[PDB]
Amino acid sequence: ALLRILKETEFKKIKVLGSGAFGTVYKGLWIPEGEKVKIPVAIKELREATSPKANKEILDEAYVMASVDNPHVCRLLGICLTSTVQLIMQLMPFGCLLDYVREHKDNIGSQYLLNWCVQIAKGMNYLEDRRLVHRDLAARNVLVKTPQHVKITDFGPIKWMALESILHRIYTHQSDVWSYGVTVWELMTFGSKPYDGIPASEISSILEKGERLPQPPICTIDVYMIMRKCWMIDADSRPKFRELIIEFSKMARDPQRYLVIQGLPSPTDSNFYRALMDEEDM
Amino acid sequence: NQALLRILKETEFKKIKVLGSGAFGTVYKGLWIPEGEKVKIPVAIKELANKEILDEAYVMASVDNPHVCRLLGICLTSTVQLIMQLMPFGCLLDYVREHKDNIGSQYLLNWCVQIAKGMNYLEDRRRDLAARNVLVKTPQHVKITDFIKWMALESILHRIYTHQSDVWSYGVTVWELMTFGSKPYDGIPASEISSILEKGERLPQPPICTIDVYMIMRKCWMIDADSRPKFRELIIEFSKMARDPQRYLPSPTDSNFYRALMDEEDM
Ligand SMILES: */C=C\C(=O)Nc1cc(C(=O)Nc2nc3cccc(C)c3n2[C@H]2CCCCN(C(=O)/C=C\*)C2)cs1
Secondary structure, three states, X not given: OXXXXXXXXXXXXXXXXXXXXXXEEEEEEEOOOOOOOOEEEEEEEEOOOOOOOHHHHHHHHHHHHOOOOOOOEOOEEEEEOOOOOEXXXXXXXXXXXXXXXXXXXXXXXXXXXXXXXXXXXXXXXXXXXXXXXXXXXXXXXXXXXXXXXXXXXXXXXXXXXXXXXXXXXXXXXXXXXXXXXXXXXXXXXXXXXXXXXXXXXXXXXXXXXXXXXXXXXXXXXXXXXXXXXXXXXXXXXXXXXXHHHHHHHHHHOOHHHHEOOOOOOOHHHHHHHHHHHOOOOO | OHHHOOOOOHHHEXXXXXXOOOXXXXXXXXXXXXXXXXXXXXXXXXXXXXXXXXXXXXHHOOOOEOOEOOOOEEEOOOOOEEEEEOOXXXXXXXXXXXXXXXXXXXXXXXXXXXXXXXXXXXXXXXXXXXXOOEEEEEOOEEEEOOOOOOOOHHHHHHOOOOHHHHHHHHHHXXXXXHOXXXXXXXXXXXXXXXXXXXXXXXXXXXXXXXXXXHHXXXXXXXXXXXXXXXXXXXXXXXXHHHOOHHHHOOOHHHXXXXXXXXXXXXX
16 A cells, blocks of 8 residues: 554644645644654644544545555545544645635746646546546645646535536536636636625526636637636536647647736756755656 | 756845754754745755855756755855755764664665765765765665765875775775764874774774675775775675675655655655
8 A cells, every 4th residue: 555544643733724625734743753853744634523434434535545646636645543534645835726826916927827727637637547536626726836836636616516516416527627627717817716706506507508707818719718618518528638738738838829918937946946845757 | 057056045045943063064954935935945054266166066966866965055145055955864873873773784784775876976977975974864765965084095195085985985984884873993083093094904893794794894995996896886785785684784655655755756
Protein backbone atom coordinates (compact mmCIF):
# COMPACT_ATOMS: atom_id res chain seq x y z
CA ALA A 1 0.00 0.00 0.00
CA LEU A 2 0.84 3.71 0.04
CA LEU A 3 -1.23 4.90 3.04
CA ARG A 4 0.40 5.30 6.45
CA ILE A 5 -1.79 4.82 9.52
CA LEU A 6 -1.00 7.57 12.04
CA LYS A 7 -1.44 7.96 15.80
CA GLU A 8 -2.62 11.03 17.68
CA THR A 9 0.74 11.22 19.48
CA GLU A 10 2.73 11.80 16.27
CA PHE A 11 0.89 14.84 14.88
CA LYS A 12 -0.73 17.97 16.29
CA LYS A 13 -3.20 20.55 15.07
CA ILE A 14 -1.82 24.06 15.51
CA LYS A 15 -4.22 26.22 13.50
CA VAL A 16 -7.40 26.15 11.41
CA LEU A 17 -7.49 27.07 7.70
CA GLY A 18 -11.09 26.32 6.63
CA SER A 19 -14.19 24.08 6.61
CA GLY A 20 -15.14 21.78 3.70
CA ALA A 21 -16.35 18.27 2.80
CA PHE A 22 -17.41 16.21 5.85
CA GLY A 23 -14.67 17.86 7.93
CA THR A 24 -12.45 20.87 8.76
CA VAL A 25 -8.95 21.51 7.33
CA TYR A 26 -6.46 22.03 10.20
CA LYS A 27 -2.87 23.09 9.54
CA GLY A 28 -0.87 20.41 11.33
CA LEU A 29 2.67 19.40 12.23
CA TRP A 30 4.00 15.85 11.94
CA ILE A 31 6.50 14.71 14.56
CA PRO A 32 8.37 11.56 13.46
CA GLU A 33 8.98 8.98 16.17
CA GLY A 34 12.38 9.36 17.79
CA GLU A 35 13.03 12.61 15.89
CA LYS A 36 13.01 16.27 16.89
CA VAL A 37 11.71 17.81 13.65
CA LYS A 38 8.20 19.15 13.04
CA ILE A 39 6.89 18.63 9.50
CA PRO A 40 3.97 20.84 8.34
CA VAL A 41 1.00 18.84 7.04
CA ALA A 42 -2.67 19.35 6.22
CA ILE A 43 -5.22 17.65 8.47
CA LYS A 44 -8.88 17.28 7.52
CA GLU A 45 -11.01 16.16 10.49
CA LEU A 46 -14.42 14.84 9.44
CA ARG A 47 -17.71 15.22 11.30
CA GLU A 48 -18.60 13.13 14.35
CA ALA A 49 -21.26 10.81 12.90
CA THR A 50 -19.70 7.50 11.84
CA SER A 51 -20.22 3.78 12.53
CA PRO A 52 -18.06 0.82 13.63
CA LYS A 53 -17.60 -0.41 10.05
CA ALA A 54 -17.55 3.13 8.62
CA ASN A 55 -13.79 3.04 9.19
CA LYS A 56 -13.64 -0.01 6.91
CA GLU A 57 -15.60 2.05 4.38
CA ILE A 58 -13.27 5.04 4.75
CA LEU A 59 -10.14 2.87 4.63
CA ASP A 60 -11.17 1.27 1.33
CA GLU A 61 -11.74 4.67 -0.27
CA ALA A 62 -8.66 6.10 1.47
CA TYR A 63 -6.46 3.41 -0.10
CA VAL A 64 -7.65 4.47 -3.56
CA MET A 65 -6.99 8.17 -2.91
CA ALA A 66 -3.52 7.20 -1.64
CA SER A 67 -2.77 5.52 -5.00
CA VAL A 68 -3.10 8.49 -7.38
CA ASP A 69 0.14 9.44 -9.17
CA ASN A 70 -0.33 12.60 -11.24
CA PRO A 71 1.30 16.03 -10.72
CA HIS A 72 -2.07 17.90 -10.89
CA VAL A 73 -4.29 15.67 -8.79
CA CYS A 74 -2.96 15.13 -5.26
CA ARG A 75 -2.15 12.28 -2.92
CA LEU A 76 -3.62 11.29 0.43
CA LEU A 77 -0.56 10.43 2.50
CA GLY A 78 -2.00 9.42 5.88
CA ILE A 79 -5.09 8.87 8.01
CA CYS A 80 -6.02 8.80 11.70
CA LEU A 81 -8.88 6.60 12.96
CA THR A 82 -10.22 8.44 16.00
CA SER A 83 -13.72 9.38 17.15
CA THR A 84 -13.63 11.79 14.20
CA VAL A 85 -11.41 10.56 11.37
CA GLN A 86 -8.44 12.75 10.46
CA LEU A 87 -6.82 12.78 7.01
CA ILE A 88 -3.21 13.87 6.49
CA MET A 89 -1.68 15.19 3.26
CA GLN A 90 0.87 17.73 2.06
CA LEU A 91 0.18 21.36 2.94
CA MET A 92 -0.61 23.62 -0.02
CA PRO A 93 0.65 27.05 1.10
CA PHE A 94 -1.35 29.20 -1.34
CA GLY A 95 -4.69 27.61 -0.40
CA CYS A 96 -7.17 27.23 -3.24
CA LEU A 97 -7.39 28.78 -6.70
CA LEU A 98 -10.72 30.44 -5.87
CA ASP A 99 -9.43 32.71 -3.09
CA TYR A 100 -6.08 33.17 -4.86
CA VAL A 101 -7.77 34.50 -8.00
CA ARG A 102 -10.11 36.64 -5.87
CA GLU A 103 -7.39 38.23 -3.72
CA HIS A 104 -5.16 38.74 -6.79
CA LYS A 105 -7.93 40.12 -9.02
CA ASP A 106 -5.37 42.14 -11.02
CA ASN A 107 -1.99 40.41 -11.46
CA ILE A 108 -3.54 37.43 -13.26
CA GLY A 109 -2.36 37.48 -16.86
CA SER A 110 -3.93 35.55 -19.71
CA GLN A 111 -1.23 32.86 -19.68
CA TYR A 112 -1.97 32.03 -16.03
CA LEU A 113 -5.68 31.49 -16.65
CA LEU A 114 -5.25 29.26 -19.71
CA ASN A 115 -2.46 27.17 -18.17
CA TRP A 116 -4.56 26.63 -15.04
CA CYS A 117 -7.28 25.17 -17.26
CA VAL A 118 -4.72 22.92 -18.96
CA GLN A 119 -3.47 21.60 -15.62
CA ILE A 120 -6.98 21.09 -14.22
CA ALA A 121 -7.89 19.26 -17.43
CA LYS A 122 -4.75 17.12 -17.11
CA GLY A 123 -5.67 16.14 -13.56
CA MET A 124 -9.30 15.43 -14.44
CA ASN A 125 -8.26 13.29 -17.40
CA TYR A 126 -6.02 11.25 -15.09
CA LEU A 127 -9.06 10.61 -12.89
CA GLU A 128 -11.17 9.62 -15.91
CA ASP A 129 -8.47 7.21 -17.10
CA ARG A 130 -8.37 5.64 -13.63
CA ARG A 131 -12.20 5.45 -13.77
CA LEU A 132 -12.87 7.56 -10.68
CA VAL A 133 -15.79 9.97 -10.32
CA HIS A 134 -14.98 13.34 -8.74
CA ARG A 135 -18.48 14.83 -8.25
CA ASP A 136 -17.18 17.91 -6.38
CA LEU A 137 -15.07 19.73 -8.97
CA ALA A 138 -14.99 23.51 -8.45
CA ALA A 139 -12.63 26.47 -8.13
CA ARG A 140 -12.59 26.01 -4.35
CA ASN A 141 -11.26 22.45 -4.79
CA VAL A 142 -8.34 23.51 -7.00
CA LEU A 143 -5.34 24.00 -4.72
CA VAL A 144 -2.35 26.16 -5.63
CA LYS A 145 1.05 24.66 -4.81
CA THR A 146 3.02 27.29 -6.73
CA PRO A 147 1.39 29.99 -8.91
CA GLN A 148 2.37 27.82 -11.90
CA HIS A 149 1.29 24.45 -10.45
CA VAL A 150 -2.31 23.78 -9.40
CA LYS A 151 -3.68 20.49 -8.08
CA ILE A 152 -7.17 19.02 -7.81
CA THR A 153 -8.35 17.87 -4.38
CA ASP A 154 -11.25 16.32 -2.47
CA PHE A 155 -12.20 13.25 -4.54
CA GLY A 156 -15.35 11.37 -3.53
CA PRO A 157 -23.05 21.81 -5.19
CA ILE A 158 -26.24 22.36 -7.21
CA LYS A 159 -24.70 25.29 -9.09
CA TRP A 160 -21.73 23.08 -10.06
CA MET A 161 -23.57 19.82 -10.81
CA ALA A 162 -24.68 18.73 -14.27
CA LEU A 163 -28.38 18.61 -15.09
CA GLU A 164 -28.47 14.81 -15.00
CA SER A 165 -26.78 14.93 -11.58
CA ILE A 166 -29.41 17.27 -10.11
CA LEU A 167 -32.34 15.49 -11.77
CA HIS A 168 -31.52 11.87 -10.87
CA ARG A 169 -28.08 11.65 -9.23
CA ILE A 170 -26.25 10.67 -12.44
CA TYR A 171 -22.50 11.22 -11.94
CA THR A 172 -20.22 10.34 -14.86
CA HIS A 173 -16.94 11.62 -16.28
CA GLN A 174 -19.08 13.80 -18.56
CA SER A 175 -20.87 15.22 -15.51
CA ASP A 176 -17.43 16.35 -14.32
CA VAL A 177 -16.98 18.08 -17.69
CA TRP A 178 -19.93 20.21 -16.58
CA SER A 179 -18.13 20.86 -13.29
CA TYR A 180 -15.00 21.67 -15.30
CA GLY A 181 -16.95 24.27 -17.27
CA VAL A 182 -18.26 25.96 -14.13
CA THR A 183 -14.75 25.87 -12.66
CA VAL A 184 -13.33 27.60 -15.74
CA TRP A 185 -16.10 30.21 -15.47
CA GLU A 186 -15.09 31.03 -11.89
CA LEU A 187 -11.43 31.49 -12.86
CA MET A 188 -12.14 33.78 -15.82
CA THR A 189 -14.68 35.77 -13.79
CA PHE A 190 -11.96 36.25 -11.13
CA GLY A 191 -13.84 34.29 -8.48
CA SER A 192 -17.44 35.33 -9.10
CA LYS A 193 -20.30 33.33 -7.62
CA PRO A 194 -22.26 31.33 -10.22
CA TYR A 195 -26.01 31.97 -10.43
CA ASP A 196 -25.66 34.70 -7.81
CA GLY A 197 -29.09 35.27 -6.29
CA ILE A 198 -30.88 32.38 -8.00
CA PRO A 199 -31.72 29.85 -5.25
CA ALA A 200 -30.43 26.28 -5.45
CA SER A 201 -33.99 24.88 -5.45
CA GLU A 202 -34.55 26.65 -8.79
CA ILE A 203 -31.30 25.97 -10.67
CA SER A 204 -32.57 22.80 -12.34
CA SER A 205 -35.53 24.84 -13.62
CA ILE A 206 -33.37 27.46 -15.35
CA LEU A 207 -31.14 24.76 -16.87
CA GLU A 208 -34.26 23.09 -18.29
CA LYS A 209 -35.03 26.42 -20.03
CA GLY A 210 -31.67 27.04 -21.72
CA GLU A 211 -30.03 29.42 -19.22
CA ARG A 212 -26.26 28.95 -19.04
CA LEU A 213 -23.76 31.17 -17.27
CA PRO A 214 -23.02 34.53 -18.95
CA GLN A 215 -20.00 35.04 -21.15
CA PRO A 216 -17.30 36.56 -18.92
CA PRO A 217 -15.92 39.91 -20.10
CA ILE A 218 -12.43 38.52 -20.76
CA CYS A 219 -13.57 35.40 -22.67
CA THR A 220 -13.70 35.36 -26.46
CA ILE A 221 -16.19 33.08 -28.19
CA ASP A 222 -13.43 30.50 -28.64
CA VAL A 223 -13.23 30.15 -24.86
CA TYR A 224 -16.96 30.67 -24.27
CA MET A 225 -17.85 28.01 -26.85
CA ILE A 226 -15.87 25.43 -24.87
CA MET A 227 -17.68 26.43 -21.67
CA ARG A 228 -21.12 26.12 -23.28
CA LYS A 229 -20.32 22.77 -24.91
CA CYS A 230 -19.45 21.41 -21.46
CA TRP A 231 -22.98 22.38 -20.36
CA MET A 232 -24.99 20.54 -23.02
CA ILE A 233 -27.99 18.59 -21.73
CA ASP A 234 -26.63 15.53 -23.56
CA ALA A 235 -23.71 14.27 -21.48
CA ASP A 236 -22.06 12.39 -24.36
CA SER A 237 -22.06 15.55 -26.51
CA ARG A 238 -19.86 17.36 -23.99
CA PRO A 239 -16.13 17.45 -24.82
CA LYS A 240 -13.76 14.91 -23.30
CA PHE A 241 -10.99 15.89 -20.90
CA ARG A 242 -8.34 14.74 -23.39
CA GLU A 243 -9.83 17.14 -25.93
CA LEU A 244 -9.89 20.02 -23.44
CA ILE A 245 -6.15 19.57 -22.84
CA ILE A 246 -5.39 19.88 -26.55
CA GLU A 247 -7.60 22.92 -27.20
CA PHE A 248 -6.55 24.80 -24.05
CA SER A 249 -2.91 24.07 -24.84
CA LYS A 250 -3.54 25.46 -28.32
CA MET A 251 -4.87 28.67 -26.78
CA ALA A 252 -2.00 28.74 -24.27
CA ARG A 253 0.53 29.12 -27.10
CA ASP A 254 -1.23 32.39 -28.05
CA PRO A 255 -2.99 33.51 -24.86
CA GLN A 256 -3.70 37.15 -25.74
CA ARG A 257 -5.73 35.94 -28.74
CA TYR A 258 -8.24 34.07 -26.56
CA LEU A 259 -8.30 36.15 -23.35
CA VAL A 260 -8.83 39.92 -23.26
CA ILE A 261 -7.45 41.43 -20.04
CA GLN A 262 -6.35 45.01 -19.40
CA GLY A 263 -2.84 45.51 -18.04
CA LEU A 264 4.69 33.63 -16.05
CA PRO A 265 7.88 34.46 -14.08
CA SER A 266 11.20 33.55 -15.74
CA PRO A 267 12.79 30.10 -15.27
CA THR A 268 15.09 31.91 -12.83
CA ASP A 269 12.00 32.20 -10.62
CA SER A 270 10.48 28.89 -11.75
CA ASN A 271 13.64 26.94 -10.89
CA PHE A 272 13.73 28.83 -7.59
CA TYR A 273 10.07 27.98 -6.94
CA ARG A 274 10.36 24.27 -7.71
CA ALA A 275 13.71 23.74 -5.95
CA LEU A 276 12.10 25.05 -2.74
CA MET A 277 8.45 23.95 -2.95
CA ASP A 278 7.72 21.75 -6.01
CA GLU A 279 10.37 19.06 -6.58
CA GLU A 280 8.05 16.61 -8.37
CA ASP A 281 8.55 15.82 -12.05
CA MET A 282 5.85 18.11 -13.42
CA ASN B 1 23.16 29.26 -16.05
CA GLN B 2 21.48 32.63 -15.57
CA ALA B 3 18.15 30.91 -14.80
CA LEU B 4 19.50 28.97 -11.79
CA LEU B 5 19.99 31.86 -9.27
CA ARG B 6 19.13 35.59 -8.78
CA ILE B 7 17.85 36.25 -5.21
CA LEU B 8 18.84 39.01 -2.70
CA LYS B 9 16.62 41.92 -1.46
CA GLU B 10 16.38 41.47 2.36
CA THR B 11 12.87 42.82 1.52
CA GLU B 12 12.07 39.13 0.84
CA PHE B 13 13.69 37.31 3.79
CA LYS B 14 14.31 37.29 7.57
CA LYS B 15 16.45 35.19 9.91
CA ILE B 16 14.39 33.76 12.77
CA LYS B 17 16.10 30.99 14.76
CA VAL B 18 19.37 29.14 15.41
CA LEU B 19 20.69 25.68 14.44
CA GLY B 20 24.27 25.38 15.71
CA SER B 21 27.08 27.32 14.05
CA GLY B 22 29.99 26.91 11.67
CA ALA B 23 33.41 28.39 11.11
CA PHE B 24 32.26 30.17 7.94
CA GLY B 25 28.87 31.22 9.29
CA THR B 26 25.81 30.26 11.29
CA VAL B 27 23.12 28.04 9.81
CA TYR B 28 20.38 29.89 11.75
CA LYS B 29 17.12 29.46 9.85
CA GLY B 30 14.83 31.92 8.06
CA LEU B 31 11.64 32.50 6.10
CA TRP B 32 11.30 33.60 2.47
CA ILE B 33 8.41 35.98 1.75
CA PRO B 34 7.52 36.06 -1.97
CA GLU B 35 6.70 39.48 -3.40
CA GLY B 36 3.00 40.27 -3.25
CA GLU B 37 2.24 37.00 -1.43
CA LYS B 38 1.39 36.16 2.18
CA VAL B 39 3.19 32.82 2.62
CA LYS B 40 6.42 32.27 4.56
CA ILE B 41 8.74 29.62 3.11
CA PRO B 42 11.41 28.09 5.41
CA VAL B 43 14.97 28.43 4.08
CA ALA B 44 18.53 28.12 5.36
CA ILE B 45 20.65 31.26 5.70
CA LYS B 46 24.47 31.32 5.89
CA GLU B 47 25.81 34.76 6.84
CA LEU B 48 29.58 34.87 6.34
CA ALA B 49 34.88 40.74 -4.56
CA ASN B 50 31.12 40.64 -5.11
CA LYS B 51 31.72 39.98 -8.81
CA GLU B 52 34.20 37.31 -7.72
CA ILE B 53 31.76 35.70 -5.28
CA LEU B 54 28.86 35.95 -7.75
CA ASP B 55 30.80 34.02 -10.40
CA GLU B 56 31.54 31.21 -7.95
CA ALA B 57 27.96 31.43 -6.67
CA TYR B 58 26.78 30.72 -10.22
CA VAL B 59 28.75 27.45 -10.14
CA MET B 60 27.17 26.29 -6.87
CA ALA B 61 23.76 26.98 -8.47
CA SER B 62 24.58 24.65 -11.40
CA VAL B 63 24.90 21.26 -9.67
CA ASP B 64 22.10 18.78 -10.46
CA ASN B 65 22.55 15.66 -8.31
CA PRO B 66 20.26 14.32 -5.55
CA HIS B 67 23.21 14.11 -3.11
CA VAL B 68 24.80 17.50 -3.91
CA CYS B 69 23.35 20.79 -2.70
CA ARG B 70 22.39 23.54 -5.12
CA LEU B 71 22.85 27.18 -4.18
CA LEU B 72 19.39 28.66 -4.60
CA GLY B 73 20.03 32.29 -3.67
CA ILE B 74 22.48 34.75 -2.12
CA CYS B 75 22.17 38.28 -0.69
CA LEU B 76 25.22 40.45 -1.50
CA THR B 77 24.40 43.15 1.10
CA SER B 78 25.82 42.97 4.65
CA THR B 79 27.94 39.78 4.45
CA VAL B 80 27.60 37.02 1.78
CA GLN B 81 24.23 35.62 2.83
CA LEU B 82 23.51 32.22 1.28
CA ILE B 83 20.06 30.68 0.73
CA MET B 84 19.27 27.00 0.23
CA GLN B 85 16.50 24.59 1.17
CA LEU B 86 16.16 24.11 4.92
CA MET B 87 17.40 20.75 6.21
CA PRO B 88 15.34 19.98 9.34
CA PHE B 89 17.60 17.16 10.58
CA GLY B 90 20.72 19.33 10.58
CA CYS B 91 23.91 17.53 9.58
CA LEU B 92 24.86 13.86 9.41
CA LEU B 93 27.49 14.34 12.14
CA ASP B 94 25.07 15.32 14.90
CA TYR B 95 22.36 12.92 13.70
CA VAL B 96 24.62 9.87 13.90
CA ARG B 97 25.72 11.10 17.33
CA GLU B 98 22.17 11.64 18.61
CA HIS B 99 20.96 8.23 17.33
CA LYS B 100 24.22 6.35 17.96
CA ASP B 101 22.36 3.11 18.78
CA ASN B 102 19.41 2.28 16.48
CA ILE B 103 21.54 2.70 13.33
CA GLY B 104 21.57 -0.65 11.57
CA SER B 105 24.22 -1.83 9.16
CA GLN B 106 22.15 -1.01 6.06
CA TYR B 107 21.74 2.61 7.17
CA LEU B 108 25.49 3.19 7.62
CA LEU B 109 26.59 1.54 4.37
CA ASN B 110 23.96 3.26 2.23
CA TRP B 111 25.00 6.64 3.64
CA CYS B 112 28.52 5.90 2.40
CA VAL B 113 27.11 4.98 -1.02
CA GLN B 114 25.22 8.27 -1.27
CA ILE B 115 28.18 10.37 -0.09
CA ALA B 116 30.31 8.56 -2.67
CA LYS B 117 27.59 9.19 -5.27
CA GLY B 118 27.63 12.90 -4.46
CA MET B 119 31.43 13.11 -4.34
CA ASN B 120 31.73 11.31 -7.68
CA TYR B 121 29.33 13.87 -9.19
CA LEU B 122 31.59 16.67 -7.95
CA GLU B 123 34.56 14.94 -9.58
CA ASP B 124 32.43 14.45 -12.69
CA ARG B 125 31.78 18.21 -12.77
CA ARG B 126 35.52 18.73 -12.08
CA ARG B 127 37.53 21.93 -0.69
CA ASP B 128 36.37 20.14 2.45
CA LEU B 129 33.96 17.20 2.88
CA ALA B 130 33.23 15.97 6.42
CA ALA B 131 30.44 14.48 8.50
CA ARG B 132 29.42 18.00 9.57
CA ASN B 133 29.01 19.11 5.93
CA VAL B 134 26.69 16.23 5.01
CA LEU B 135 23.11 17.42 5.46
CA VAL B 136 20.19 15.05 6.08
CA LYS B 137 17.02 15.71 4.08
CA THR B 138 15.30 12.57 5.32
CA PRO B 139 16.95 9.79 7.37
CA GLN B 140 17.25 8.01 4.01
CA HIS B 141 18.70 10.94 2.02
CA VAL B 142 22.03 12.62 2.80
CA LYS B 143 23.48 15.52 0.86
CA ILE B 144 26.86 17.29 0.62
CA THR B 145 26.87 21.05 1.17
CA ASP B 146 28.91 24.24 1.52
CA PHE B 147 31.98 25.32 -0.49
CA ILE B 148 43.26 19.71 8.94
CA LYS B 149 42.24 16.33 10.37
CA TRP B 150 40.17 15.68 7.22
CA MET B 151 42.72 16.89 4.65
CA ALA B 152 45.02 14.63 2.68
CA LEU B 153 48.74 14.65 3.40
CA GLU B 154 49.56 16.50 0.18
CA SER B 155 46.88 19.06 1.08
CA ILE B 156 48.36 19.69 4.53
CA LEU B 157 51.94 19.82 3.25
CA HIS B 158 51.47 22.29 0.39
CA ARG B 159 47.81 22.94 -0.44
CA ILE B 160 47.40 20.18 -3.06
CA TYR B 161 43.64 19.64 -3.48
CA THR B 162 42.54 17.06 -6.05
CA HIS B 163 39.67 14.61 -6.45
CA GLN B 164 41.93 12.07 -4.74
CA SER B 165 42.43 14.47 -1.83
CA ASP B 166 38.65 14.29 -1.42
CA VAL B 167 38.98 10.49 -1.23
CA TRP B 168 41.09 11.10 1.88
CA SER B 169 38.38 13.38 3.26
CA TYR B 170 35.85 10.72 2.28
CA GLY B 171 37.79 8.15 4.30
CA VAL B 172 37.82 10.30 7.43
CA THR B 173 34.10 10.96 7.00
CA VAL B 174 33.39 7.22 6.74
CA TRP B 175 35.42 6.73 9.93
CA GLU B 176 33.21 9.30 11.67
CA LEU B 177 30.03 7.50 10.58
CA MET B 178 31.17 4.03 11.65
CA THR B 179 32.55 5.41 14.93
CA PHE B 180 29.10 6.98 15.49
CA GLY B 181 30.42 10.54 15.35
CA SER B 182 33.80 10.26 17.05
CA LYS B 183 36.37 13.04 16.70
CA PRO B 184 39.42 12.13 14.57
CA TYR B 185 42.83 12.45 16.22
CA ASP B 186 41.18 13.21 19.55
CA GLY B 187 43.77 14.97 21.70
CA ILE B 188 46.58 15.76 19.18
CA PRO B 189 46.48 19.62 18.92
CA ALA B 190 47.57 22.60 16.73
CA SER B 191 50.28 21.62 14.18
CA GLU B 192 51.25 17.91 14.56
CA ILE B 193 48.87 15.83 12.44
CA SER B 194 51.17 16.04 9.40
CA SER B 195 54.00 14.61 11.51
CA ILE B 196 52.06 11.49 12.50
CA LEU B 197 50.65 10.96 9.00
CA GLU B 198 54.08 10.71 7.38
CA LYS B 199 54.95 7.88 9.80
CA GLY B 200 51.56 6.55 10.96
CA GLU B 201 49.55 3.40 10.28
CA ARG B 202 46.32 5.41 9.82
CA LEU B 203 43.34 5.92 12.13
CA PRO B 204 42.21 2.94 14.25
CA GLN B 205 39.71 0.36 13.04
CA PRO B 206 36.26 1.20 14.43
CA PRO B 207 34.70 -1.52 16.60
CA ILE B 208 31.83 -2.25 14.18
CA CYS B 209 34.02 -2.46 11.05
CA THR B 210 35.13 -5.80 9.68
CA ILE B 211 38.51 -6.07 7.98
CA ASP B 212 36.82 -5.68 4.58
CA VAL B 213 35.54 -2.22 5.54
CA TYR B 214 38.68 -1.05 7.33
CA MET B 215 40.81 -1.99 4.31
CA ILE B 216 38.80 0.45 2.18
CA MET B 217 39.46 3.15 4.79
CA ARG B 218 43.18 2.31 4.80
CA LYS B 219 43.46 2.46 1.00
CA CYS B 220 41.90 5.94 0.94
CA TRP B 221 44.74 7.16 3.20
CA MET B 222 47.74 6.02 1.15
CA ILE B 223 50.54 8.55 0.80
CA ASP B 224 50.34 8.09 -2.98
CA ALA B 225 47.25 9.98 -4.14
CA ASP B 226 46.96 7.99 -7.37
CA SER B 227 46.98 4.72 -5.39
CA ARG B 228 43.86 5.75 -3.46
CA PRO B 229 40.57 4.29 -4.72
CA LYS B 230 38.40 6.29 -7.09
CA PHE B 231 34.96 7.56 -6.12
CA ARG B 232 33.44 5.38 -8.85
CA GLU B 233 35.04 2.34 -7.18
CA LEU B 234 33.80 3.33 -3.71
CA ILE B 235 30.20 3.42 -4.97
CA ILE B 236 30.41 -0.12 -6.35
CA GLU B 237 32.13 -1.68 -3.33
CA PHE B 238 29.92 0.06 -0.76
CA SER B 239 26.82 -0.94 -2.74
CA LYS B 240 28.12 -4.52 -2.77
CA MET B 241 28.41 -4.45 1.03
CA ALA B 242 24.96 -2.85 1.34
CA ARG B 243 23.29 -5.91 -0.22
CA ASP B 244 24.73 -7.99 2.67
CA PRO B 245 25.28 -5.37 5.37
CA GLN B 246 25.46 -7.63 8.44
CA ARG B 247 28.37 -9.46 6.78
CA TYR B 248 30.55 -6.32 6.74
CA LEU B 249 29.38 -4.47 9.87
CA PRO B 250 11.90 1.51 6.85
CA SER B 251 9.09 -0.24 4.91
CA PRO B 252 8.11 1.29 1.54
CA THR B 253 4.97 2.58 3.28
CA ASP B 254 7.19 4.84 5.40
CA SER B 255 9.70 5.66 2.64
CA ASN B 256 6.91 6.87 0.35
CA PHE B 257 5.49 8.83 3.30
CA TYR B 258 8.86 10.52 3.89
CA ARG B 259 9.39 11.49 0.25
CA ALA B 260 5.83 12.70 -0.37
CA LEU B 261 6.19 15.23 2.47
CA MET B 262 9.87 16.22 2.46
CA ASP B 263 11.82 14.59 -0.42
CA GLU B 264 10.04 14.87 -3.77
CA GLU B 265 13.28 14.76 -5.75
CA ASP B 266 14.17 11.74 -7.88
CA MET B 267 15.94 8.68 -6.43
C1 LIG C 1 -4.11 17.94 -2.66
C2 LIG C 1 -3.93 17.58 -1.39
C3 LIG C 1 -4.90 16.72 -0.62
O1 LIG C 1 -4.89 15.51 -0.84
N1 LIG C 1 -5.81 17.27 0.34
C4 LIG C 1 -5.96 18.63 0.74
C5 LIG C 1 -5.00 19.62 1.04
C6 LIG C 1 -5.56 20.94 1.43
C7 LIG C 1 -4.85 22.25 1.82
O2 LIG C 1 -3.63 22.28 1.84
N2 LIG C 1 -5.53 23.49 2.17
C8 LIG C 1 -4.99 24.79 2.57
N3 LIG C 1 -3.70 25.15 2.70
C9 LIG C 1 -3.67 26.51 3.12
C10 LIG C 1 -2.52 27.29 3.37
C11 LIG C 1 -2.68 28.60 3.78
C12 LIG C 1 -3.96 29.14 3.93
C13 LIG C 1 -5.13 28.42 3.70
C14 LIG C 1 -6.40 29.15 3.92
C15 LIG C 1 -5.00 27.02 3.26
N4 LIG C 1 -5.86 25.87 2.90
C16 LIG C 1 -7.38 25.69 2.83
C17 LIG C 1 -7.92 24.83 3.98
C18 LIG C 1 -9.30 24.27 3.65
C19 LIG C 1 -9.58 24.23 2.15
C20 LIG C 1 -10.23 25.53 1.63
N5 LIG C 1 -9.35 26.74 1.60
C21 LIG C 1 -9.59 27.74 0.63
O3 LIG C 1 -8.88 28.73 0.61
C22 LIG C 1 -10.70 27.60 -0.35
C23 LIG C 1 -10.48 27.29 -1.63
C24 LIG C 1 -8.26 26.93 2.54
C25 LIG C 1 -6.93 20.82 1.41
S1 LIG C 1 -7.52 19.31 0.96
